[PDB]
Amino acid sequence: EAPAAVVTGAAKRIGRAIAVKLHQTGYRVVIHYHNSAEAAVSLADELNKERSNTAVVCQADLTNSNVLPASCEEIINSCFRAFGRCDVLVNNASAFYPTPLVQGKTVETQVAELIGTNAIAPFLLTMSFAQRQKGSSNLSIVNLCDAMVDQPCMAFSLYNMGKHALVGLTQSAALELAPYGIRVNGVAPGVSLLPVAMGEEEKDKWRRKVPLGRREASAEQIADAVIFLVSGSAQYITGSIIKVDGGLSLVHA
Amino acid sequence: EAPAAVVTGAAKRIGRAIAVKLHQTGYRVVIHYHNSAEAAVSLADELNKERSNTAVVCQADLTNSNVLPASCEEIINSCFRAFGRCDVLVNNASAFYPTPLVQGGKTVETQVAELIGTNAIAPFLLTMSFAQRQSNLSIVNLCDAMVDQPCMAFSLYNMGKHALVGLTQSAALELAPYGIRVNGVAPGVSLLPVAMGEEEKDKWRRKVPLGRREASAEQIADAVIFLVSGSAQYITGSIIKVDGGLSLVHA
Amino acid sequence: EAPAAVVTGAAKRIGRAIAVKLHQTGYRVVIHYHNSAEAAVSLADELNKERSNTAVVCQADLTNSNVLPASCEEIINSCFRAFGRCDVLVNNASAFYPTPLVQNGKTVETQVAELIGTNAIAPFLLTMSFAQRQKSNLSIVNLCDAMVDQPCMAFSLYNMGKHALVGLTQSAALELAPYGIRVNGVAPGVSLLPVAMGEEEKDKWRRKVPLGRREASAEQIADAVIFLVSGSAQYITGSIIKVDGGLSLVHA
Amino acid sequence: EAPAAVVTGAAKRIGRAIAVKLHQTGYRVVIHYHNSAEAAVSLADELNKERSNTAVVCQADLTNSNVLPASCEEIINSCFRAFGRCDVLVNNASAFYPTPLVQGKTVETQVAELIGTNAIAPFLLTMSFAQRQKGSSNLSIVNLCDAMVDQPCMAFSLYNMGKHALVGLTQSAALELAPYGIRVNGVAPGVSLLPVAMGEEEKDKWRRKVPLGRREASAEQIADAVIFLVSGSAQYITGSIIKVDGGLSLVHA
Numbered sequence A, D: 001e002a003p004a005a006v007v008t009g010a011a012k013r014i015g016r017a018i019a020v021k022l023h024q025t026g027y028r029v030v031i032h033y034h035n036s037a038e039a040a041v042s043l044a045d046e047l048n049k050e051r052s053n054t055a056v057v058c059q060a061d062l063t064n065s066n067v068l069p070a071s072c073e074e075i076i077n078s079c080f081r082a083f084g085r086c087d088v089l090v091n092n093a094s095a096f097y098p099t100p101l102v103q104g105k106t107v108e109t110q111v112a113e114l115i116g117t118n119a120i121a122p123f124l125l126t127m128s129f130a131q132r133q134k135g136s137s138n139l140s141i142v143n144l145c146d147a148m149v150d151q152p153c154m155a156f157s158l159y160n161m162g163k164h165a166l167v168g169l170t171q172s173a174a175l176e177l178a179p180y181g182i183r184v185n186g187v188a189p190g191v192s193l194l195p196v197a198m199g200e201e202e203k204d205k206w207r208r209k210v211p212l213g214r215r216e217a218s219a220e221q222i223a224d225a226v227i228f229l230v231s232g233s234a235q236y237i238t239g240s241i242i243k244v245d246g247g248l249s250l251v252h253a
Numbered sequence B: 001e002a003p004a005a006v007v008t009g010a011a012k013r014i015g016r017a018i019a020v021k022l023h024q025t026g027y028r029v030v031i032h033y034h035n036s037a038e039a040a041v042s043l044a045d046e047l048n049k050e051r052s053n054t055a056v057v058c059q060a061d062l063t064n065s066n067v068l069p070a071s072c073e074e075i076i077n078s079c080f081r082a083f084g085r086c087d088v089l090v091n092n093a094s095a096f097y098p099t100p101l102v103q104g105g106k107t108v109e110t111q112v113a114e115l116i117g118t119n120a121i122a123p124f125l126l127t128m129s130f131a132q133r134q135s136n137l138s139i140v141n142l143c144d145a146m147v148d149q150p151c152m153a154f155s156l157y158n159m160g161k162h163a164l165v166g167l168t169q170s171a172a173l174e175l176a177p178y179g180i181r182v183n184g185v186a187p188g189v190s191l192l193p194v195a196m197g198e199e200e201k202d203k204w205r206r207k208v209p210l211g212r213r214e215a216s217a218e219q220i221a222d223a224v225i226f227l228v229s230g231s232a233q234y235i236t237g238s239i240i241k242v243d244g245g246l247s248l249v250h251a
Numbered sequence C: 001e002a003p004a005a006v007v008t009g010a011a012k013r014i015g016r017a018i019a020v021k022l023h024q025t026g027y028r029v030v031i032h033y034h035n036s037a038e039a040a041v042s043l044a045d046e047l048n049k050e051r052s053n054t055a056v057v058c059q060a061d062l063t064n065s066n067v068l069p070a071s072c073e074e075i076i077n078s079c080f081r082a083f084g085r086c087d088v089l090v091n092n093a094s095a096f097y098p099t100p101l102v103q104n105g106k107t108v109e110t111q112v113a114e115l116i117g118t119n120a121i122a123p124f125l126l127t128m129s130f131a132q133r134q135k136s137n138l139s140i141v142n143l144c145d146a147m148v149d150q151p152c153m154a155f156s157l158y159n160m161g162k163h164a165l166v167g168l169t170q171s172a173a174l175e176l177a178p179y180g181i182r183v184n185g186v187a188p189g190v191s192l193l194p195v196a197m198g199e200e201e202k203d204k205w206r207r208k209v210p211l212g213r214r215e216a217s218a219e220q221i222a223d224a225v226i227f228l229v230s231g232s233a234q235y236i237t238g239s240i241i242k243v244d245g246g247l248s249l250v251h252a
């Protein structure tokens, strides 16, 4: 029987690339999304045309709130409902925007979005993933981290806090879930897919910083590291975060 | 004239030792507390006996909520009101307890609010208010030398402390142009929990390479005092372990 | 045509498993060895039985000395002479023994030479020679140590060598990126234990490992090397992959 | 009676400021030097003018060789000869120059000088320091590290290797010497005193990168962190490396 994977924020960009590569490797996939319903359905249609009944979509907001735990339980339940199992969880979904310390979202919304998506939802999804594992096995979680966590973007404190918290989770969860045979790793992009609304000049400013090829990672390149970590070739690997950054983090100011 | 400092969770233990040393150094102090009003006032009385009108108290819950930003704004405002200035912020207050990932009291979302609130969100909001309201200005965040070798089933706590490292670095960068330095002190084992039994205490003590004992609260405060001093005027984004080598010790 | 790899200290244990997995992946291999000539030759015979003319052996001492740069140049040259190319270098060979700060036959300068030479200087000189011969998926993989920041008592020179190797991995990734040469690391925690180590001591190490209370096989370490030299790692440079079963996360 | 300190490479620059500040704190000092004999003797003169018989010079090459252990032993011996005790060792002396990987001194002498000064000499000095401790007391070692070790300068491999090895030594020696009450820490400058050979435009380019003040650290600012680490206010601190970098290491490419 084919294993099954949940990928959060999988409608487009890195999340889609991960869903696609997992699908190509023989996984059934839950394509979680928030707003990008058309994109998500379009992806699921493509994947189901390749192999029938191997992809479903699952809508949820991952902003922190008192219902977030129920929402995360439901995402995992959706994988079991569709496929009867849940072998892999990929925490990809992420809010990303500045929160300057000095000067229409309230600061409490910002906290709920940036810390919820990047850290609390991963934690709750990890809880639910583990709790459901009830009656060979290759169970794992991959968290999408950030190679620049220690050289952060100016004015991105809450975003960076959430990514740092995700490193914490990756390590704490690896330790705690090891006895259940669930590995927990991370993949840390440098610059991959630039924002759709970023101008070309600004894109190039980033590209030129990258030692290896002076270009951003393809979405596939990021997906490759994920696929490695979920594979049998990584069965002794847990609590590791693999940078996929073309040397960007090694470059001084 | 004298500089002024805010210390969160200053009524007891490490926070109390920090407030005391900052006061001995010549600071006026705001002693923040949540539940420990008696101890907060007793400390303020002691410091005020030494130098009149140099210590005040400030109550607040630092759990994340809809009202936390206003609470944090008021803590900073209390310092300006009492003393006309705020030169130093010490983010010491902290919730600490386990949050197992798997189940065999508090809801998980209350746990998130308390652990991520006290250890990360409140420090962020306080940092915001401190900066907005502005010489040797600095912030010191009480971190945790064991962040990368965490205690089993403490994922939320550890996440909060990791977030606090991120805040420390991000705020150091962003606040450098304003001349506000932002650093951390990372204890290993200092004052053991009051509810911990003596046998467990000795088990932790024996792990510590340097003297096989826990750090006094004074020894933690010493690192804080260095970081806020003129001797650290070029230091920002730095986290000083004060752990007697505990973090270097393998399983 | 088939790519070629140099693996240092490839006669036995982890280096052997790396050489074998590379071979299985389609590489021709230079099996470097110091003292284990019989094991090196037996491996080369095995590999050439599988595919003729796909394995050769290369003897060299990688202790630091005046002649080490020449020795390292010759190891790289051996790959070119045998196979006409050198696509992968794996820096695996390593001296490992205690060097207490306060006090067997060795002088301290010999201990420096052996520990810093094998773990850091020889990898640097090999990296220089590898790069200089580059006139495509070229990469270098350094065998690091996941416990580099929680070191074993009285292993200062060893640990200094392994820290130096992290610095090399990073510096060489940056410098060699314009040549399209990737440089990465694999950091085992506990993998193959010494055969003579008593089982009681072995089991002490095993029980520390969160994931399965066992050491890594050599093959598991090799798997990470194979990923890093592959087309699935084309954007990965300056990264050190821990393969430690969570051992480095475990507090004292 | 007064404690005694050895500072390597103490004739000029950072090492000189360290020796001066230790002396102002009440230490007697061994001013180690290699080529800067005139400056070393001058500094000893100034300190002895302040308090007679509180400073001596000690000449040594700290390049790696078969005689390096003897030379290191002799430095420590010189502190005991002069002052009857050795409480503090500051490993400051450092060779610093590029060693490109792709194509003066032979590569073997570059290894000897860069790895010798930055790593092997510290190690041998640490051995000799610990061994000589015959046996209020506040023994410690401070290693001058580099805040940019993970964001190194292009074509400085051997230098960066030596400084990485020095981090390892700091950690290993902290662990091993803790039972003897010897603390072992580091101070990691970012940009402090710029090379005398560096041109003015280039100096200003480095200054511009520093978030805190857009200026290099003074030697006295670096010495202040050393003074802290050797003091009674750092009694529980061992195996710690304190960055003194004005935020430079936090700044992305």
Ligand SMILES: NC(=O)c1ccc[n+]([C@@H]2O[C@H](COP(=O)([O-])OP(=O)(O)OC[C@H]3O[C@@H](n4cnc5c(N)ncnc54)[C@H](OP(=O)(O)O)[C@@H]3O)[C@@H](O)[C@H]2O)c1
Residues within 6 Å of the ligand: A008, A009, A010, A011, A012, A013, A014, A015, A032, A033, A034, A035, A036, A037, A060, A061, A062, A063, A091, A092, A093, A094, A095, A096, A113, A117, A144, A145, A146, A147, A188, A189, A190, A191, A192, A193, A194
């Ligand atoms: N792109 C890069 O260069 C880069 C660099 C470093 C790290 N990363 C990390 O890699 C991952 C993927 O990056 P990316 O650029 O592909 O991500 P992205 O496009 O910025 O966001 C991915 C998805 O996150 C989902 N999301 C945002 N807010 C959400 C919410 N409140 N609830 C539920 N889902 C929400 C969105 O889903 P809908 O569209 O369905 O609303 C969105 O499509 C992220 O974790 C990111 O931080 C990326």
Ligand SMILES: NC(=O)c1ccc[n+]([C@@H]2O[C@H](COP(=O)([O-])OP(=O)(O)OC[C@H]3O[C@@H](n4cnc5c(N)ncnc54)[C@H](OP(=O)(O)O)[C@@H]3O)[C@@H](O)[C@H]2O)c1
Residues within 6 Å of the ligand: B008, B009, B010, B011, B012, B013, B014, B015, B032, B033, B034, B035, B036, B037, B060, B061, B062, B063, B091, B092, B093, B094, B095, B096, B114, B118, B142, B143, B144, B145, B186, B187, B188, B189, B190, B191, B192
């Ligand atoms: N003790 C150690 O060995 C150790 C080790 C590593 C790190 N640290 C860090 O060092 C700092 C001091 O440690 P400690 O042991 O002295 O701390 P602690 O006694 O556990 O807590 C200090 C204070 O935090 C305040 N606090 C807790 N929850 C709060 C809330 N919801 N709102 C506002 N305040 C709240 C409490 O104030 P009230 O009493 O007034 O309610 C408490 O007295 C903490 O940041 C801690 O994580 C300590």
Ligand SMILES: NC(=O)c1ccc[n+]([C@@H]2O[C@H](COP(=O)([O-])OP(=O)(O)OC[C@H]3O[C@@H](n4cnc5c(N)ncnc54)[C@H](OP(=O)(O)O)[C@@H]3O)[C@@H](O)[C@H]2O)c1
Residues within 6 Å of the ligand: C008, C009, C010, C011, C012, C013, C014, C015, C032, C033, C034, C035, C036, C037, C060, C061, C062, C063, C091, C092, C093, C094, C095, C096, C114, C118, C143, C144, C145, C146, C187, C188, C189, C190, C191, C192, C193
């Ligand atoms: N095994 C582990 O648990 C573990 C843990 C952490 C890191 N690692 C790292 O992983 C790598 C493989 O480990 P391993 O246990 O397989 O290594 P190992 O058996 O201790 O040594 C590998 C080979 O290194 C070669 N070597 C030693 N001294 C040499 C010298 N002077 N010149 C040339 N070669 C020399 C020897 O070759 P000859 O036999 O031909 O003389 C030896 O067989 C090493 O880099 C090690 O540090 C291993």
Ligand SMILES: NC(=O)c1ccc[n+]([C@@H]2O[C@H](COP(=O)([O-])OP(=O)(O)OC[C@H]3O[C@@H](n4cnc5c(N)ncnc54)[C@H](OP(=O)(O)O)[C@@H]3O)[C@@H](O)[C@H]2O)c1
Residues within 6 Å of the ligand: D008, D009, D010, D011, D012, D013, D014, D015, D032, D033, D034, D035, D036, D037, D060, D061, D062, D063, D091, D092, D093, D094, D095, D096, D113, D117, D144, D145, D146, D147, D188, D189, D190, D191, D192, D193, D194
């Ligand atoms: N300056 C910076 O911005 C900066 C940045 C990061 C880290 N650091 C570190 O801080 C420390 C001090 O920096 P600095 O700039 O003051 O150093 P420096 O001027 O470059 O060198 C200090 C001294 O090292 C001695 N030295 C060089 N080679 C030697 C050898 N072969 N044997 C014995 N001694 C030798 C020289 O003594 P003689 O003059 O007597 O020959 C020299 O004066 C160094 O460890 C450096 O790596 C400095």
Ligand SMILES: Nc1cc(SCc2ccccc2)nc(N)n1
Residues within 6 Å of the ligand: A094, A095, A096, A146, A191, A192, A193, A194, A195, A206
């Ligand atoms: N860290 C990220 C990045 C992105 S878009 C990638 C990017 C944005 C700005 C500058 C350079 C590259 N989206 C998320 N959710 N998280």
Ligand SMILES: Nc1cc(SCc2ccccc2)nc(N)n1
Residues within 6 Å of the ligand: B094, B095, B096, B144, B189, B190, B191, B192, B193, B204
């Ligand atoms: N990290 C901490 C510790 C403490 S109590 C110290 C302690 C607890 C458990 C084992 C050893 C030592 N309080 C807070 N807020 N944060």
Ligand SMILES: Nc1cc(SCc2ccccc2)nc(N)n1
Residues within 6 Å of the ligand: C093, C094, C095, C096, C145, C190, C191, C192, C193, C194, C205
């Ligand atoms: N880190 C190593 C280990 C070994 S032998 C394996 C071993 C593992 C655990 C304890 C003692 C011995 N060889 C090298 N070169 N490097």
Ligand SMILES: Nc1cc(SCc2ccccc2)nc(N)n1
Residues within 6 Å of the ligand: D094, D095, D096, D146, D191, D192, D193, D194, D195, D206
């Ligand atoms: N790391 C160092 C630096 C220096 S001179 C300071 C400098 C050099 C290059 C760029 C900017 C500043 N000397 C030694 N021994 N070690």
